[PDB]
Scaffold this motif. Structure first.
Motif, PDB file in Angstrom:
ATOM      1  N   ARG A 114       0.827  -1.223   0.000  1.00 18.50           N
ATOM      2  CA  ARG A 114       0.000   0.000   0.000  1.00 18.50           C
ATOM      3  C   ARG A 114       0.856   1.266   0.000  1.00 18.50           C
ATOM      4  N   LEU A 115       1.813   1.365   0.926  1.00 18.62           N
ATOM      5  CA  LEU A 115       2.668   2.547   1.077  1.00 18.62           C
ATOM      6  C   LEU A 115       3.547   2.756  -0.169  1.00 18.62           C
ATOM      7  N   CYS A 116       4.152   1.684  -0.690  1.00 21.35           N
ATOM      8  CA  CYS A 116       4.960   1.730  -1.910  1.00 21.35           C
ATOM      9  C   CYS A 116       4.141   2.142  -3.144  1.00 21.35           C
ATOM     10  N   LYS A 117       2.948   1.565  -3.362  1.00 24.38           N
ATOM     11  CA  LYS A 117       2.070   1.960  -4.485  1.00 24.38           C
ATOM     12  C   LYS A 117       1.653   3.428  -4.420  1.00 24.38           C
ATOM     13  N   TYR A 118       1.401   3.965  -3.225  1.00 25.92           N
ATOM     14  CA  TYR A 118       1.088   5.387  -3.062  1.00 25.92           C
ATOM     15  C   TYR A 118       2.273   6.271  -3.473  1.00 25.92           C
ATOM     16  N   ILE A 119       3.491   5.942  -3.021  1.00 20.60           N
ATOM     17  CA  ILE A 119       4.720   6.637  -3.431  1.00 20.60           C
ATOM     18  C   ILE A 119       4.872   6.588  -4.959  1.00 20.60           C
ATOM     19  N   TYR A 120       4.777   5.412  -5.590  1.00 21.25           N
ATOM     20  CA  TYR A 120       4.911   5.286  -7.050  1.00 21.25           C
ATOM     21  C   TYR A 120       3.901   6.148  -7.832  1.00 21.25           C
ATOM     22  N   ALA A 121       2.698   6.367  -7.289  1.00 22.55           N
ATOM     23  CA  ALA A 121       1.619   7.108  -7.946  1.00 22.55           C
ATOM     24  C   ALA A 121       1.558   8.617  -7.620  1.00 22.55           C
ATOM     25  N   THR A 175      12.890   5.854  -5.534  1.00 20.16           N
ATOM     26  CA  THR A 175      14.053   4.944  -5.615  1.00 20.16           C
ATOM     27  C   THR A 175      14.322   4.221  -4.291  1.00 20.16           C
ATOM     28  N   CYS A 176      14.215   4.897  -3.146  1.00 19.45           N
ATOM     29  CA  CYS A 176      14.346   4.227  -1.851  1.00 19.45           C
ATOM     30  C   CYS A 176      13.189   3.241  -1.601  1.00 19.45           C
ATOM     31  N   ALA A 177      11.952   3.625  -1.934  1.00 20.97           N
ATOM     32  CA  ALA A 177      10.768   2.791  -1.745  1.00 20.97           C
ATOM     33  C   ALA A 177      10.828   1.492  -2.568  1.00 20.97           C
ATOM     34  N   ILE A 178      11.199   1.550  -3.857  1.00 17.87           N
ATOM     35  CA  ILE A 178      11.329   0.337  -4.686  1.00 17.87           C
ATOM     36  C   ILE A 178      12.419  -0.608  -4.158  1.00 17.87           C
ATOM     37  N   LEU A 179      13.547  -0.082  -3.663  1.00 19.42           N
ATOM     38  CA  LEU A 179      14.614  -0.903  -3.077  1.00 19.42           C
ATOM     39  C   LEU A 179      14.192  -1.580  -1.766  1.00 19.42           C
ATOM     40  N   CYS A 180      13.502  -0.865  -0.873  1.00 19.71           N
ATOM     41  CA  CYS A 180      12.931  -1.445   0.346  1.00 19.71           C
ATOM     42  C   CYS A 180      11.838  -2.482   0.035  1.00 19.71           C
ATOM     43  N   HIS A 181      11.005  -2.244  -0.983  1.00 23.02           N
ATOM     44  CA  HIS A 181       9.974  -3.186  -1.428  1.00 23.02           C
ATOM     45  C   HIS A 181      10.595  -4.499  -1.931  1.00 23.02           C
ATOM     46  N   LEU A 206      17.307  -0.067 -12.423  1.00 25.60           N
ATOM     47  CA  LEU A 206      18.242   0.608 -11.514  1.00 25.60           C
ATOM     48  C   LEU A 206      19.702   0.185 -11.726  1.00 25.60           C
ATOM     49  N   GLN A 207      19.954  -0.988 -12.315  1.00 20.33           N
ATOM     50  CA  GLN A 207      21.299  -1.510 -12.596  1.00 20.33           C
ATOM     51  C   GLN A 207      22.172  -0.514 -13.387  1.00 20.33           C
ATOM     52  N   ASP A 208      21.594   0.171 -14.378  1.00 26.05           N
ATOM     53  CA  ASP A 208      22.298   1.172 -15.190  1.00 26.05           C
ATOM     54  C   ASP A 208      22.414   2.531 -14.474  1.00 26.05           C
ATOM     55  N   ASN A 209      21.367   2.932 -13.747  1.00 28.20           N
ATOM     56  CA  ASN A 209      21.212   4.294 -13.225  1.00 28.20           C
ATOM     57  C   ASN A 209      21.828   4.515 -11.827  1.00 28.20           C
ATOM     58  N   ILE A 210      21.984   3.459 -11.020  1.00 29.37           N
ATOM     59  CA  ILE A 210      22.406   3.552  -9.608  1.00 29.37           C
ATOM     60  C   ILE A 210      23.813   4.150  -9.424  1.00 29.37           C
ATOM     61  N   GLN A 211      24.669   4.086 -10.450  1.00 27.71           N
ATOM     62  CA  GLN A 211      26.030   4.641 -10.427  1.00 27.71           C
ATOM     63  C   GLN A 211      26.063   6.165 -10.210  1.00 27.71           C
ATOM     64  N   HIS A 212      24.970   6.866 -10.529  1.00 30.52           N
ATOM     65  CA  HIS A 212      24.823   8.314 -10.344  1.00 30.52           C
ATOM     66  C   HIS A 212      23.956   8.701  -9.130  1.00 30.52           C
ATOM     67  N   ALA A 213      23.404   7.727  -8.400  1.00 29.76           N
ATOM     68  CA  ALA A 213      22.649   7.962  -7.170  1.00 29.76           C
ATOM     69  C   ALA A 213      23.572   8.179  -5.955  1.00 29.76           C
ATOM     70  N   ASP A 214      23.057   8.816  -4.897  1.00 26.19           N
ATOM     71  CA  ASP A 214      23.851   9.091  -3.692  1.00 26.19           C
ATOM     72  C   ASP A 214      24.365   7.804  -3.008  1.00 26.19           C
ATOM     73  N   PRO A 215      25.571   7.813  -2.402  1.00 23.63           N
ATOM     74  CA  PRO A 215      26.150   6.637  -1.748  1.00 23.63           C
ATOM     75  C   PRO A 215      25.264   5.900  -0.719  1.00 23.63           C
ATOM     76  N   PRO A 216      24.411   6.545   0.109  1.00 24.67           N
ATOM     77  CA  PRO A 216      23.481   5.817   0.980  1.00 24.67           C
ATOM     78  C   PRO A 216      22.423   5.005   0.211  1.00 24.67           C
ATOM     79  N   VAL A 217      22.007   5.474  -0.971  1.00 28.08           N
ATOM     80  CA  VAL A 217      21.088   4.745  -1.865  1.00 28.08           C
ATOM     81  C   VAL A 217      21.829   3.600  -2.561  1.00 28.08           C
ATOM     82  N   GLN A 218      23.106   3.792  -2.911  1.00 32.03           N
ATOM     83  CA  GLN A 218      23.974   2.719  -3.412  1.00 32.03           C
ATOM     84  C   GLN A 218      24.187   1.613  -2.363  1.00 32.03           C
ATOM     85  N   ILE A 219      24.392   1.963  -1.085  1.00 30.57           N
ATOM     86  CA  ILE A 219      24.473   0.994   0.026  1.00 30.57           C
ATOM     87  C   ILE A 219      23.152   0.224   0.181  1.00 30.57           C
ATOM     88  N   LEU A 220      22.001   0.903   0.089  1.00 26.37           N
ATOM     89  CA  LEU A 220      20.691   0.242   0.106  1.00 26.37           C
ATOM     90  C   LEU A 220      20.529  -0.717  -1.085  1.00 26.37           C
TER      91      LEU A 220
END
Lengths: 41, 228, 293
Positions: free
Chosen positions: B93-100, B109-115, B137-151
């Motif tokens: 429910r919480l993830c679908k609300y964020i996506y919409a 990006t944090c919500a899809i990784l936690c899901h 996310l495999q292609d795009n994660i290289q430009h995301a912040d290091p805490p999101v890369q750790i997630l």
């Protein structure tokens, strides 16, 4: 066996779907392949 | 607090008791912002509620699966306290609300990784795989912040462990190969620094990397990772 | 009960027009798989949003009693009034197409712009007349006059620019009309044009393109199982086109039944053996979402 009528979307303005399926309404569309290799570090 | 207490002292277990009060305060603030909040405040609380739930294995959902309801009669009062909304249905429910509703690509990006992590933790490999592939996310994660890369790295380890639990040894090996063959797995997962790299880094960078470490109750054992 | 477990009618109906569901419901009634009263109720509910008021009255009599509800009689009166109004508005437009010189020009000229300019210069034809012709074609279709609907949608499609909002809907409506008439050769040509229009649309979102392909896959089943070349076209469309294969795997895994049947029933033993290896991979990938015998 109860025959349940399938839900058909009626489009009065043209041929084709009038709405995005509910399963994809809240999801940003990105194409993916189930054959793509997972595990990029 | 949970970055500066020792992981092996009894004090860690004492400060972890307060995590239940933190989870309850976030629930009180969620209900309050569902009635009165803006959509951009709601998506941020939903991310904080997701952040304390995605790593917890739902032993109540598992206990409800281990006892099929064959036949003993007690109390309608014990049913109203059993209607505790499954961590999985709440997460979906919480993830679908964020996506919409989310205007920021970060919270999405944090919500899809936690899901994906929560599906992978619950042996739900197909759902976790199809969400990971759909995200690109495999292609795009290289430009995301290091805490999101750790997630993402922690979610990729959890996908490899999920593939292993499903007997998919080949896909488990592929998902874990780059992380373990790096010799830097402890750092890539935010679980500490390797003492052999302490000799080559600036003290200011080290002091920023120490603040990016995940608390010990969010660690995935490196010996379990290497054994798998 | 086991026959009903593998019935796809409810799943397929979600991607069909209401008028294309009626042949499926008639097939289920002849097979006696479902309760006939529940099937007649479902047929009545689908007819309630159509202009086929006489057919809705016959289904109502078979379900309940000979006492036709006041609401159905009132709806009949409204539909007959709308029919007369639309006929009066379309009569001057139909007279322009009955000119034998215009009919020759429509057959000879493939350029819809030149044909529009010719009709504008000779008859004072306007864009408003295309919108009136389209509304009249939709009304004829809702009344069950599929032959008239196909003819008016043919005139609309020849004159309309490919960028018009109704251009795609007119291709769907013509395909539906030709299927309901059982004109499988014309339906195969219209299916090919509709497919080329969807595949060449560079401006539609990936999600809209997915939805359009998903609907095209379901509508194509009527044409491909009745046309003698249809079994080869199912294999070439659903298995070897990545866009349609992705639509099957994402939105409509139940179409793997029809793809598998088309591969197994293929007349060329060499094609059958070659295609089977790629079919098995797709079935194995979707074995978690869809299973049937």
């Amino acid at each position: 066996a109860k025959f349940l009528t399938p839900v058909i979307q009626d489009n009065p303005s043209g041929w084709g779907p009038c709405a995005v399926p509910e399963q994809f309404r809240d999801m940003p569309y990105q194409p993916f392949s189930k054959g793509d290799r997972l595990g990029k570090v | 607090i949970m970055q500066n207490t020792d992981p092996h002292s009894q004090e860690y277990v004492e400060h972890l008791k307060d995590e239940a009060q933190v989870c309850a305060i976030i629930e009180r603030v969620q209900r309050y912002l569902e009635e009165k909040g803006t959509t951009e405040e709601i998506c941020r609380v939903y991310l904080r509620r997701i952040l304390h739930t995605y790593y917890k294995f739902d032993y109540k959902a598992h206990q409800r699966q281990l006892t099929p309801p064959e036949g003993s009669s007690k109390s309608e009062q014990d049913q109203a306290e059993n209607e505790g909304e499954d961590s999985a249905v709440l997460m979906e429910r919480l993830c679908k609300y964020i996506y919409a509703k989310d205007r920021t690509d970060r919270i999405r990006t944090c919500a899809i990784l936690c899901h994906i992590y929560h599906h992978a933790l619950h042996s739900r490999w197909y759902q976790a795989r199809d969400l990971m592939l759909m995200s690109h996310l495999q292609d795009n994660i290289q430009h995301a912040d290091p805490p999101v890369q750790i997630l993402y790295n922690r979610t990729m380890v959890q996908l490899g462990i999920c593939a292993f639990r499903q007997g998919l040894t080949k896909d488990a090996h592929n998902a874990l190969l780059d992380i373990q063959s790096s010799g830097r797995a402890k750092e890539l997962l935010g679980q500490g620094l390797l003492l052999r790299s302490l000799q080559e880094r600036n003290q200011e960078q080290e002091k920023v990397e120490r603040r990016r470490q995940v608390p010990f109750h969010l660690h995935i054992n490196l010996e379990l990772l290497e054994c798998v | 009960n086991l026959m009903a477990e593998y019935d796809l009618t409810t799943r397929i109906a979600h991607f069909l027009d209401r008028h294309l569901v009626f042949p499926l419901l008639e097939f289920l009634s002849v097979k006696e798989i479902y309760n006939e009263k529940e099937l007649l109720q479902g047929k009545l509910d689908l007819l309630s949003d159509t202009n086929m008021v006489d057919f809705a009255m016959d289904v109502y009599k078979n379900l309940y009693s000979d006492d036709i509800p006041h609401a159905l009689r009132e709806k009949r009166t409204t539909v007959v009034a709308q029919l007369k109004q639309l006929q009066a508005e379309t009569e001057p437009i139909v007279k322009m197409f009955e000119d034998p010189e215009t009919t020759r020009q429509m057959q000879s000229t493939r350029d819809g712009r030149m044909l529009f300019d010719y009709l504008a210069d000779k008859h004072g034809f306007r864009q408003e007349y295309l919108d009136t012709l389209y509304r009249y074609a939709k009304f004829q279709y809702e009344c069950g006059n599929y032959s008239g609907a196909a003819e008016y949608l043919y005139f609309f499609r020849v004159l309309v620019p490919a960028t018009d909002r109704n251009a795609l809907s007119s291709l769907w409506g013509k395909l539906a009309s030709e299927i309901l008439m059982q004109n499988w050769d014309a339906a195969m040509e219209d299916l090919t044009r509709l497919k080329e229009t969807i595949d060449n649309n560079s401006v539609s979102s990936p999600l809209q393109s997915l939805q359009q392909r998903t609907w095209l896959i379901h509508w194509s089943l009527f044409v491909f199982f009745n046309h003698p070349k249809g079994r080869d076209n199912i294999i070439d469309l659903f298995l070897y086109q990545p866009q349609y294969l992705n639509a099957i795997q994402t939105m409509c895994p139940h179409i793997l039944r029809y793809l598998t049947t088309a591969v197994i029933t293929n007349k060329d033993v060499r094609k059958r053996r070659q295609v089977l290896k790629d079919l098995v991979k797709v079935i194995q990938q979707e074995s978690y979402t869809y299973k049937d015998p």
